[PDB]
Amino acid sequence: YAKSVYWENTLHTLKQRQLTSYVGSVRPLVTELDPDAPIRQKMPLDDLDREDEVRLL
Amino acid sequence: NSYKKVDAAELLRLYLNYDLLEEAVDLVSEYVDAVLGKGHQYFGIEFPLSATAPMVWLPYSSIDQLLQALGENSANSHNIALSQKILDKLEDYQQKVDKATRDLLYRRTL
Amino acid sequence: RRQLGLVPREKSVTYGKGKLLMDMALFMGRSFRVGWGPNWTLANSGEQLFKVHLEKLSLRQRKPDEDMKLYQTPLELKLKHSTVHVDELCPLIVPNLGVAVIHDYADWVKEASGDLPEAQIVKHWSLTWTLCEALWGHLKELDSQLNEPREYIQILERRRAFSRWLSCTATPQIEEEVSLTQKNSPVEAVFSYLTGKRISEACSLAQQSGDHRLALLLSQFVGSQSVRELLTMQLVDWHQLQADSFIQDERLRIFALLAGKPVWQLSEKKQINVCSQLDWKRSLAIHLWYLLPPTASISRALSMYEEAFQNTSDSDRYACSPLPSYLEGSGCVIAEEQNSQTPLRDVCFHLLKLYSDRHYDLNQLLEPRSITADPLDYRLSWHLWEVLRALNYTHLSAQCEGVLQASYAGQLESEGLWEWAIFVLLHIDNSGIREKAVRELLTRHCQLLETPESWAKETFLTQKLRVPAKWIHEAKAVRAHMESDKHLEALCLFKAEHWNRCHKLIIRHLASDAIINENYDYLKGFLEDLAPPERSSLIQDWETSGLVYLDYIRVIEMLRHIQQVDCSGNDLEQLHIKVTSLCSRIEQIQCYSAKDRLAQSDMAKRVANLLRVVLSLHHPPDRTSDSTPDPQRVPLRLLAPHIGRLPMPEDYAMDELRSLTQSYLRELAVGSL
Amino acid sequence: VSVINTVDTSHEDMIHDAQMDYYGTRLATCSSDRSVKIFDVRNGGQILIADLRGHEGPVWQVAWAHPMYGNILASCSYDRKVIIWREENGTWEKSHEHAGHDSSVNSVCWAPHDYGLILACGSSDGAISLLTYTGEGQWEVKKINNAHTIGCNAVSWAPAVVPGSLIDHPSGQKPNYIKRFASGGCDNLIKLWKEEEDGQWKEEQKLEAHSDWVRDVAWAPSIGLPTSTIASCSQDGRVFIWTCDDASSNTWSPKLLHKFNDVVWHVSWSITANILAVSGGDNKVTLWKESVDGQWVCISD
Structure with a gap:
């Protein structure tokens, strides 16, 4: 699903949550984008990146 | 007037357990008036009966038993008047539980 | 006061007010919920079938020495006539394709038909299995034949046997009907004998009443079609001539029966229905004896009887439905129930249908209402289906098989035959439902007390039904956690899907108290059978926990042995290596409480003293003084590097340092001579 | 039907629910008297194990967990609370308290043990909560807001x-x-x-x-x-x-x-x-x- 960045959908979701127009539901996600953030924060990715990481591994 | 801010129903159970029927009639008279905004806060109640608040409650099990405990002495006109003093007051209450239910349903269907 | 009752609902101030949502004491202040339990138990908070009742759905009023034999005998017959397959994780039980089961059941009910108080139900089951004997079972008239018996000779003797069954199922009502009618009307009494084929008694009563020409007519009727056709003319004559209306309607009913006419139309426009007021069996027996030739099949007698009760476009109904044997005699004219589009009949009729019509409905056949006055008694329903499944009938629905198997397994749970509820659930073809249903039921019924009754059921399930014993002890572990016995939880987790659960329980609940009591040999009993490489390679955290406790015990045992026998330096090298391997591993135990800190610290203190005794046996004296080996001669140089890793309390470490300074002062004082 | 027992459950006020454990050995009962009362009922006896007061309103349902997780009970109340209770060493204390509802919580139900130790709860605000035990004392909580209109x-x-x-x-x-x-x-x-x-x-x-x-x-x-x-x-x-x-x-x-x-x-x-x-x-x-x-x-x- 990702085709221009690593964890593209979670990166897009964070770049969207920074906008003061975010009238979305706040799904718990990582707030950092190093590859240890899911295990340091004990928080998930969004499931497109979470499929690609499981496919890739 | 400390226990009213904790449980007026456990007090009403005690008053029925001890035959204090006139104190039970005026405790019920104060409790119904507490839910109706004549000092809700003295009965621990956060909010009086309103289509803008949590839903309210009353110990009807104890009130049915109080109306029986009065009516078991039906030869006395005072027991009849004390029973009417509950019943007539429970309709100035329940007509407003009906209206507050209609006012709330018209705020969960818009 | 005394407390009063809950005020009855039609005197409640809450009455009718359940919609007043803003007051929860009106919206729910008179609601209640009820909870089921195993064995068909219910916790009732209302009125019976503050307080709560515990109530049980149970069939009849308990004679366990009698009631249980009507379950257990059919079940120990069916368990001879299925195969057990073991090629899946949960075994499957499948019928033996054949006929034998019909005799196992028919002769069992012949023995059971005596003094037993269920005698009405047991006698209806006797009619059902002797009907299966007469349709699909076997013989006393073809076993005499020393050659393979022709299809028609079989069909003839099946009809001769059923031509007894339809008299035997009719006599007690005929014998009461005659006892009442004989003295008021001998014509009705003679007709009642004829509807049971008692033609000798009918002729006898006709000679006794003064009706000797009725006796002559009836004696000549046991074969001849000429008398049937001469009466067929004589009835046509009496009708056309309008002379019928000077003969008794009850006598015209006999003449119509003999003439092979099910209904006769009189010149009055009266009709005489020959099957009127009768039961279902004598109605079918009239079709088998008077409306058909001696050579016809059972299947034609039944189809002509169905042609007598169905709504055609061209003929009225004249035969009757008349029901299972618990609704007979009742006077119940069923006024066509305005929901129930299938009118109830006997299981014996539904089996005769299935013999005559291979695609007839199995649902009306297997429903308990066709068998008994109880919608909960599936005893015969399941044992009929697990004969029809063996007779290669396969057009039941999987919901209807599921409802039959689950209802009969629940009937076996409710009266405590839970091992036979497993036998029923092991006939579930669907493996994923079969394993679940057996693991769930085991998890309810397995006891921590291994009673003679639990042991008999567990040995029955494992040695007959091949149930994987791992689930009996999984169930005992799930029970042991609820009853808090961590020894029986460890020991039942050990017999089951196991490895890790038992180990991580032992290290939190058993290891430290066993060390504190010096009960090493008990803790060993769990740990040496956890230790095998086929098991320990599947245990989390083993080498820093269970292996440390176990190597400590085996180090104590190998010194317990060297303190009793002339053992070799090779074994003392091994002991020193095993002790050195243990110091920097007591270092690594997970401890949760001061019990675990006590176990770890006295293990460490014991190891510091074991190391001294092992090293003084590596440093024995010269052969000039016959003294015992001194643990205070050990070189400091071999003690301190290993004691400087032992987790030991400040008072244990202080007195270890006093022992180490004592041996250091000897390494000095023997260095100055 | 037939009676085994007629438990005198010491409740002074209306009983809203009565539930046994997975084995039919115990009975839990909840009421308008701000209590959940637990009994042993084995062989047709009655023994009171606990008077679990500590809801503050009328309690509307009880639910036993599957014995695979040990001796756990849940209950829900008019005061917006769901309380989880546990028996350890034979004494009962509170093992969770969830007040995350906006009116009376009218029902509770546990998951099949195969899903993990999960509780579901339905509320008069219109929402549902799910509570998942995450390990050694902790709980996840999910709230499905507006799951029903008018109320759940x-x-x-x-x-x-x-x-x-x-x-x-x-x-x-x-x-x-x-x-x-x-x-x-x-x-x-x-x-x-x-x-x-x-x-x-x-x-x-x-x-x-x-x-x-x-x-x-x-x-x-x-x-x-x-x-x-x-x-x-x-x-x-x-x-x-x-x-x-x-x-x-x-x-x-x-x-x-x-x-x-x-x-x-x-x-x-x-x-x-x-x-x-x-x-x-x-x-x-x-x-x-x-x-x-x-x-x-x-x-x-």
Whole structure:
């Protein structure tokens, strides 16, 4: 699903949550984008990146 | 007037357990008036009966038993008047539980 | 006061007010919920079938020495006539394709038909299995034949046997009907004998009443079609001539029966229905004896009887439905129930249908209402289906098989035959439902007390039904956690899907108290059978926990042995290596409480003293003084590097340092001579 | 029927629920007297184990956990609370307290043990909560806001083996446990709910046939039966059975079982799924059975 960045959908979701127009539901996600953030924060990715990481591994 | 801010129903159970029927009639008279905004806060109640608040409650099990405990002495006109003093007051209450239910349903269907 | 009752609902101030949502004491202040339990138990908070009742759905009023034999005998017959397959994780039980089961059941009910108080139900089951004997079972008239018996000779003797069954199922009502009618009307009494084929008694009563020409007519009727056709003319004559209306309607009913006419139309426009007021069996027996030739099949007698009760476009109904044997005699004219589009009949009729019509409905056949006055008694329903499944009938629905198997397994749970509820659930073809249903039921019924009754059921399930014993002890572990016995939880987790659960329980609940009591040999009993490489390679955290406790015990045992026998330096090298391997591993135990800190610290203190005794046996004296080996001669140089890793309390470490300074002062004082 | 016991449950006020453990050895009972009372009932005895006061309102349901997790009980109240209680060393204390609801919490139900230790709770604000035990004392909490309009009244889980849902699986893999539950409310709806591949919870299907507020709803235990079945009841006095005859169709049929003279309060499935119990507004229970002809017959009247 990702085709221009690593964890593209979670990166897009964070770049969207920074906008003061975010009238979305706040799904718990990582707030950092190093590859240890899911295990340091004990928080998930969004499931497109979470499929690609499981496919890739 | 400390226990009213904790449980007026456990007090009403005690008053029925001890035959204090006139104190039970005026405790019920104060409790119904507490839910109706004549000092809700003295009965621990956060909010009086309103289509803008949590839903309210009353110990009807104890009130049915109080109306029986009065009516078991039906030869006395005072027991009849004390029973009417509950019943007539429970309709100035329940007509407003009906209206507050209609006012709330018209705020969960818009 | 005394407390009063809950005020009855039609005197409640809450009455009718359940919609007043803003007051929860009106919206729910008179609601209640009820909870089921195993064995068909219910916790009732209302009125019976503050307080709560515990109530049980149970069939009849308990004679366990009698009631249980009507379950257990059919079940120990069916368990001879299925195969057990073991090629899946949960075994499957499948019928033996054949006929034998019909005799196992028919002769069992012949023995059971005596003094037993269920005698009405047991006698209806006797009619059902002797009907299966007469349709699909076997013989006393073809076993005499020393050659393979022709299809028609079989069909003839099946009809001769059923031509007894339809008299035997009719006599007690005929014998009461005659006892009442004989003295008021001998014509009705003679007709009642004829509807049971008692033609000798009918002729006898006709000679006794003064009706000797009725006796002559009836004696000549046991074969001849000429008398049937001469009466067929004589009835046509009496009708056309309008002379019928000077003969008794009850006598015209006999003449119509003999003439092979099910209904006769009189010149009055009266009709005489020959099957009127009768039961279902004598109605079918009239079709088998008077409306058909001696050579016809059972299947034609039944189809002509169905042609007598169905709504055609061209003929009225004249035969009757008349029901299972618990609704007979009742006077119940069923006024066509305005929901129930299938009118109830006997299981014996539904089996005769299935013999005559291979695609007839199995649902009306297997429903308990066709068998008994109880919608909960599936005893015969399941044992009929697990004969029809063996007779290669396969057009039941999987919901209807599921409802039959689950209802009969629940009937076996409710009266405590839970091992036979497993036998029923092991006939579930669907493996994923079969394993679940057996693991769930085991998890309810397995006891921590291994009673003679639990042991008999567990040995029955494992040695007959091949149930994987791992689930009996999984169930005992799930029970042991609820009853808090961590020894029986460890020991039942050990017999089951196991490895890790038992180990991580032992290290939190058993290891430290066993060390504190010096009960090493008990803790060993769990740990040496956890230790095998086929098991320990599947245990989390083993080498820093269970292996440390176990190597400590085996180090104590190998010194317990060297303190009793002339053992070799090779074994003392091994002991020193095993002790050195243990110091920097007591270092690594997970401890949760001061019990675990006590176990770890006295293990460490014991190891510091074991190391001294092992090293003084590596440093024995010269052969000039016959003294015992001194643990205070050990070189400091071999003690301190290993004691400087032992987790030991400040008072244990202080007195270890006093022992180490004592041996250091000897390494000095023997260095100055 | 036949009586085993007639427990004198020491409640001074109306009892709203009465539930036994998985083995029928204990009894828990809740009431308007701000208490849950636990008993031993073995062999027809009665012994009080605990008077669990510490809800502050009337308590509307109790639920025992599966014994695989040990001696755990949940209960819900008018005060917005759901309290979890546990017996350890033989003493009872509180093991969780959730107050995250905006009105009275009217029902609670545990998951099948195969899903993990998960509780569901339904509230008079209109929401549902799910509470998952994460380990050694901790809990996750999910809140499905607005799950029913007007209010939520009852919750009941789907059993961990859905019929047919195993045929495609080659021997040696695990079952993929498709977690589901049903819920009823004052919108006249029964709704079916599922967990998705994101761990969020979703309205899967609706069941619309009552003309008045749904009081209660219960899923049938999948034992022997190849179908997926639900019961539900209403303020108009109906009871409906609901079948799902193909788990891949996800399609349901409404079958009317009865319509009583007043409200029906609760629906309760037998531990062998073959029988339904029904609480009537006239203080009664009635008992109901599916025939081999698939018709629903009474066994109490």
